[PDB]
Amino acid sequence: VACPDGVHTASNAACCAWFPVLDDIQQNLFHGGQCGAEAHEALRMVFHDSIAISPKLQSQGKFGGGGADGSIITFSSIETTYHPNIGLDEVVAIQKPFIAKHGVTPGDFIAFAGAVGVSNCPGAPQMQFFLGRPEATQAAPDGLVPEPFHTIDQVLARMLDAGGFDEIETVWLLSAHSIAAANDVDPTISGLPFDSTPGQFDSQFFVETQLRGTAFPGKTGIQGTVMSPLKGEMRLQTDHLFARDSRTACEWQSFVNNQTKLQEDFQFIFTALSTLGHDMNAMIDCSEVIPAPKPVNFGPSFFPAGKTHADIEQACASTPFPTLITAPGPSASVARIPPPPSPN
Amino acid sequence: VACPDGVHTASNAACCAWFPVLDDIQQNLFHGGQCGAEAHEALRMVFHDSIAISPKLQSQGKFGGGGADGSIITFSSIETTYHPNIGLDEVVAIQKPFIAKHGVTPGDFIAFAGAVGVSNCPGAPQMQFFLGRPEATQAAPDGLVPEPFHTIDQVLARMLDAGGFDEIETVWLLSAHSIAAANDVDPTISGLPFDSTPGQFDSQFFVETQLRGTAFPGKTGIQGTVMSPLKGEMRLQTDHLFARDSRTACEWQSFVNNQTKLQEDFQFIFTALSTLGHDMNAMIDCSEVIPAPKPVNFGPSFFPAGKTHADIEQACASTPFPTLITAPGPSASVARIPPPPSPN
Ligand code: HEM
Ligand code: HEM
Ligand SMILES: *[C@@H]1O[C@H](CO[C@H]2O[C@@H](C)[C@@H](O)[C@@H](O)[C@@H]2O)[C@@H](O[C@@H]2O[C@H](CO)[C@@H](O)[C@H](O)[C@H]2NC(C)=O)[C@H](O)[C@H]1NC(C)=O
Ligand SMILES: *[C@H]1O[C@H](CO)[C@@H](O[C@H]2O[C@H](CO)[C@@H](O)[C@H](O)[C@@H]2O)[C@H](O)[C@@H]1O
Ligand SMILES: *[C@@H]1O[C@H](CO)[C@@H](O)[C@H](O)[C@H]1NC(C)=O
Ligand SMILES: *[C@H]1O[C@H](CO)[C@@H](O)[C@H](O)[C@@H]1O
Ligand SMILES: *[C@H]1O[C@H](CO)[C@@H](O)[C@H](O)[C@@H]1O
Numbered sequence: 001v002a003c004p005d006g007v008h009t010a011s012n013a014a015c016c017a018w019f020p021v022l023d024d025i026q027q028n029l030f031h032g033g034q035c036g037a038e039a040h041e042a043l044r045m046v047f048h049d050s051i052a053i054s055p056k057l058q059s060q061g062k063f064g065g066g067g068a069d070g071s072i073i074t075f076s077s078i079e080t081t082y083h084p085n086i087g088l089d090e091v092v093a094i095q096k097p098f099i100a101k102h103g104v105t106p107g108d109f110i111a112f113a114g115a116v117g118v119s120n121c122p123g124a125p126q127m128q129f130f131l132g133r134p135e136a137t138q139a140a141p142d143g144l145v146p147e148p149f150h151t152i153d154q155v156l157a158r159m160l161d162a163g164g165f166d167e168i169e170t171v172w173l174l175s176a177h178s179i180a181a182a183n184d185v186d187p188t189i190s191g192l193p194f195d196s197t198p199g200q201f202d203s204q205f206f207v208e209t210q211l212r213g214t215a216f217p218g219k220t221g222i223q224g225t226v227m228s229p230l231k232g233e234m235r236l237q238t239d240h241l242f243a244r245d246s247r248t249a250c251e252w253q254s255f256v257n258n259q260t261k262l263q264e265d266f267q268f269i270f271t272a273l274s275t276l277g278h279d280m281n282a283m284i285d286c287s288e289v290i291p292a293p294k295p296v297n298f299g300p301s302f303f304p305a306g307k308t309h310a311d312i313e314q315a316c317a318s319t320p321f322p323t324l325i326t327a328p329g330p331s332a333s334v335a336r337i338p339p340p341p342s343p344n
Numbered sequence: 345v346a347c348p349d350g351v352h353t354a355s356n357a358a359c360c361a362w363f364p365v366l367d368d369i370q371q372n373l374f375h376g377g378q379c380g381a382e383a384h385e386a387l388r389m390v391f392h393d394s395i396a397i398s399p400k401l402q403s404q405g406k407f408g409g410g411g412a413d414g415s416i417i418t419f420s421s422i423e424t425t426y427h428p429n430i431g432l433d434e435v436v437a438i439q440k441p442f443i444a445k446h447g448v449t450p451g452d453f454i455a456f457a458g459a460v461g462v463s464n465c466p467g468a469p470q471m472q473f474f475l476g477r478p479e480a481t482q483a484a485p486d487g488l489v490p491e492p493f494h495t496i497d498q499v500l501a502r503m504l505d506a507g508g509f510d511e512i513e514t515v516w517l518l519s520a521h522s523i524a525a526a527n528d529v530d531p532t533i534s535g536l537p538f539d540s541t542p543g544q545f546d547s548q549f550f551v552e553t554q555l556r557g558t559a560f561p562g563k564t565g566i567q568g569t570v571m572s573p574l575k576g577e578m579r580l581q582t583d584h585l586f587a588r589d590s591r592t593a594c595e596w597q598s599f600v601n602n603q604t605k606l607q608e609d610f611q612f613i614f615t616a617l618s619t620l621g622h623d624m625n626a627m628i629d630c631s632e633v634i635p636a637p638k639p640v641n642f643g644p645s646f647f648p649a650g651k652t653h654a655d656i657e658q659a660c661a662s663t664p665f666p667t668l669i670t671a672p673g674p675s676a677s678v679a680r681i682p683p684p685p686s687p688n
């Protein structure tokens with residue numbers, strides 16, 4: 001169908017209005033389509049907005065939250081005070097102007113920006129975008145977003161309540177930490193990545209969390225973190241535990257050297273996550289507006305410079321960690337990703 | 345020496361003025377230290393400024409140019425009209441204000457910007473900076489910067505006249521095409537990279553130019569270009585010929601899988617190029633102002649997705665092209681690097 005603008009075409013008229021939002025954010029939020037601080041922040045926003053849903057609280061007569069309803073923006077003055085949501089007050093502040101200019105809901109904007117932000121990362125899957133998330137009525141309660149100091153059992157339970165995500169699917173979701181940094185965990189350094197390739201959607205996160213830890217990247221012993229294997233890299237205690245837990249270890253290892261599996265799983269689970277609190281069959285598929293992802297321009301998984309197969313703590317009992325190629329050069333260090341400055 | 349900053353430190357007081365220049369271009373020219381369009385442009389400037397020097401014209405009583413003297417900016421009205429300098433008028437226009445703002449010489453600024461620009465690219469060597477290039481007195485004549493349709497013999501003569509670079513050293517200087525795109529060779533499309541990793545100072549350029557060429561990326565038969573092996577990648581005819589010439593083929597192949605050789609050679613030759621027309625001995629070493637290069641966060645050289653050792657056109661007779669690992673995913677395609685918008 002021809003859009004009213006005379007310029008675009010869409011298989012559903014409701015999709016028309018997203019073309020202008022795409023051009024605006026590619027240019028002004030992601031600074032020319034980068035997989036940078038803003039793209040990583042857009043993906044974290046999808047998770048903090050979406051997982052705040054609890055059939056278990058609902059069943060007890062309590063509001064368990066609306067899932068993917070943009071409540072983190074509409075009710076940011078409540079929701080960004082929660083400890084799991086640290087730093088999102090500034091992310092809301094960067095995203096607000098775009099929502100206002102385009103007259104779209106905060107919920108649909110979050111899912112759209114998260115999908116477009118991921119597509120800018122080499123190795124990303126083709127991302128989907130389902131449309132139809134009315135404004136939130138109420139703020140989600142606290143206690144719904146997982147913390148890096150929670151036990152594996154506590155995280156697995158929350159995930160299963162929120163969305164019926166088992167432990168296999170939870171491992172797939174954590175693929176998101178392959179394009180991510182920590183700005184607010186270590187008070188002395190902001191922008192410490194979780195893998196040595198925060199600008200690439202790959203399996204380095206799955207390789208590097210399996211290495212033995214040798215030091216804290218900044219301030220020593222922060223709760224929710226453990227020693228990481230590389231200077232400049234942060235390791236969260238949960239990611240450390242998932243890589244070594246008997247229920248999840250082999251799934252964790254399965255992404256090592258399997259970019260195809262990584263893409264397929266994440267493409268699926270991201271659609272599941274972004275539509276929590278809604279009926280997908282009642283939403284409009286505007287996936288056609290999301291651009292083709294940046295192509296892979298990297299080889300197979302590797303051991304960072306200075307590390308060998310001997311540095312691997314094997315945890316998958318049925319399958320031994322593969323013997324990967326070591327990167328060239330001097331012992332690896334990871335460069336920081338400085339966060340955006342306050343607003344515009 | 346304490347810098348009359350009340351802050352910084354340098355071994356030579358003349359180096360303190362470059363700290364402020366650093367900060368300004370890192371944020372405003374390179375848009376937060378990236379290895380993007382402007383960083384690539386700054387490196388191209390070094391070459392186009394420095395190589396316009398000719399002992400052979402001088403000995404005939406003609407001005408052969410001043411080498412690294414900033415003449416491409418002082419005399420932009422003349423130099424940027426030469427065919428080999430296509431697109432450099434927009435680059436001069438972008439660089440001029442910083443020069444005016446900090447009151448440094450144009451030649452010193454060009455070398456400083458190119459060193460800083462390259463250090464932003466993962467895989468780069470530690471870059472040097474020698475200070476002391478007085479303003480140009482005259483515009484270099486034309487006929488001094490190589491063209492992609494020139495023969496190997498002609499390019500080699502030109503380089504040997506200019507700075508005494510043999511065929512070996514010429515192969516090293518061409519490592520710069522590992523972090524570069526063509527904005528103006530195909531009139532149909534700008535930003536076509538020469539390797540599939542324009543944001544990494546690596547050996548993919550040396551791998552990729554050796555693959556059999558299969559299609560033109562835009563318009564067919566453009567002068568000074570040949571068929572490249574991947575959609576979205578341009579292959580220059582000089583680059584094609586160097587990979588296959590008996591004089592240069594083995595030196596070209598020596599960089600495949602030798603990140604260390606790649607770095608050491610380029611560190612050296614870049615210093616050699618940037619001081620053409622001056623006595624390095626009378627220059628101040630201000631290398632301590634240049635940031636440590638972004639670390640390697642990539643594995644060994646690889647064949648792009650869809651290519652194998654079978655696709656390589658062997659040119660080095662003494663050493664066969666190594667069997668590299670093939671990248672994951674579907675047949676590789678190369679994403680464009682859009683040029684900066686024209687401030688005129
Ligand atoms: C399930 C257990 C999880 C826990 C304990 C956890 C923990 C964290 C922590 C503590 C940070 C740093 C935040 C800051 O410093 O302000 C982080 C950031 C990040 N997380 Fe998670 N996370 C979980 C799962 C997820 C999931 C499933 C995704 C989304 C699909 C997600 C996407 C992100 C990304 C993209 C960032 C980086 C933000 C940016 O770079 O600014 N995380 N997470
Ligand atoms: C000596 C034979 C060489 C030839 C024939 C040549 C040819 C070219 C051509 C035709 C382009 C595209 C320009 C345009 O489309 O505007 C280009 C870009 C580039 N060249 Fe060379 N070049 C040579 C050597 C070098 C060397 C020695 C260096 C620096 C040390 C260099 C640095 C670059 C860079 C970094 C760019 C990309 C510019 C940006 O992306 O905008 N070139 N080269
Ligand atoms: C990475 O590079 C150095 C540089 O050496 C040579 O690389 C060859 C492929 C060759 O074509 C030639 O042009 C170049 O000089 C490799 O070998 C080194 O040889 C030099 C000379 O004395 C030394 O600088 C190095 O220390 C020496 N290495 C050793 C082990 O002696 C080096 O071997 C190479 N690595 C690989 C992967 O081959
Ligand atoms: C590296 O090893 C390979 C074996 O995988 C050899 O390559 C053979 O196969 C190539 C296609 O993969 C082909 O182009 C080549 O000529 C060989 O027949 C290669 O010689 C190296 O020894
Ligand atoms: C990669 O994952 C696929 C599933 O998507 C699986 O069949 C295959 O065994 C895995 N291969 C590797 C290289 O581990
Ligand atoms: C080599 O040194 C680097 C830089 O200190 C570390 O990041 C790495 O673990 C190894 O010790
Ligand atoms: C390790 O060192 C690198 C360079 O080796 C830095 O970029 C990084 O911040 C880390 O401290």
Ligand SMILES: *[C@H]1O[C@H](CO)[C@@H](O)[C@H](O)[C@@H]1O
Binds near residue numbers: 573574
């Ligand atoms: C596979 O396909 C791509 C096109 O997507 C080419 O770049 C490549 O050369 C191979 O044929």
Ligand SMILES: *[C@H]1O[C@H](CO)[C@@H](O)[C@H](O)[C@@H]1O
Binds near residue numbers: 594660663664
């Ligand atoms: C081919 O190149 C190799 C590098 O792999 C050299 O060692 C050899 O002598 C020949 O020139």
Ligand SMILES: *[C@H]1O[C@H](CO)[C@@H](O)[C@H](O)[C@@H]1O
Binds near residue numbers: 294576
């Ligand atoms: C091959 O495909 C990529 C994206 O998949 C493009 O960006 C490129 O220009 C080429 O057509």
Ligand SMILES: [Ca+2]
Binds near residue numbers: 049050065068071
């Ligand atoms: Ca919500």
Ligand SMILES: [Ca+2]
Binds near residue numbers: 199200201
């Ligand atoms: Ca990564």
Ligand SMILES: [Ca+2]
Binds near residue numbers: 484
């Ligand atoms: Ca000059």
Ligand SMILES: [Ca+2]
Binds near residue numbers: 541543544546547548
């Ligand atoms: Ca490259």
